[PDB]
Design a protein around this ligand. Sequence first.
Ligand SMILES: [Zn+2]
Ligand SMILES: [Zn+2]
Ligand SMILES: [Zn+2]
Ligand SMILES: [Zn+2]
Length: 182
Amino acid sequence: MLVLVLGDLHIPHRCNSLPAKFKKLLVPGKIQHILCTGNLCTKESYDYLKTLAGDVHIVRGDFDENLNYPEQKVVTVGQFKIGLIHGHQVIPWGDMASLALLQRQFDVDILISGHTHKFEAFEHENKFYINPGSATGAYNALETNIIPSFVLMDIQASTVVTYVYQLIGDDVKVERIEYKKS
Ligand SMILES: [Zn+2]
Ligand SMILES: [Zn+2]
Ligand SMILES: [Zn+2]
Ligand SMILES: [Zn+2]
């Protein structure tokens, strides 16, 4: 069962729409789940996504005006606990109460967040971490040379393969990753 992990689009603000070369691999009736790290910044996009799959999970990010979007979802997909948070939040450490509701977010197998726009994926101590980067390769306060990416995930048994699509000029190069959990 296959999962589209993406987000940080910023449409239409930090680009006019999805990179053509991308929407060309996003076909409806292929993706079971979508986990979106927020920042579509519009309805247009929510519906585009709702087409590729029915199971859409999106979370409220920085300045996301929709309030029916939870600040943090924890979704089970197969036997995988998958945390999902926009990733701007940054929780004041010294607020211990705030901290304790985070041992929920850390107690997951896949951690997804975004907002940084810099892609990122890896294993660490029998947990997988993922920032799907920006699907529209949008800019933030820092730099501007930022590779558009998104991640698909094949979840089966206790194995997850994570495909990282990133648009690097002309090509679209796919980094494949085998997360297995003991
Ligand atoms: Zn963003
Ligand atoms: Zn925006
Ligand atoms: Zn779901
Ligand atoms: Zn953000």
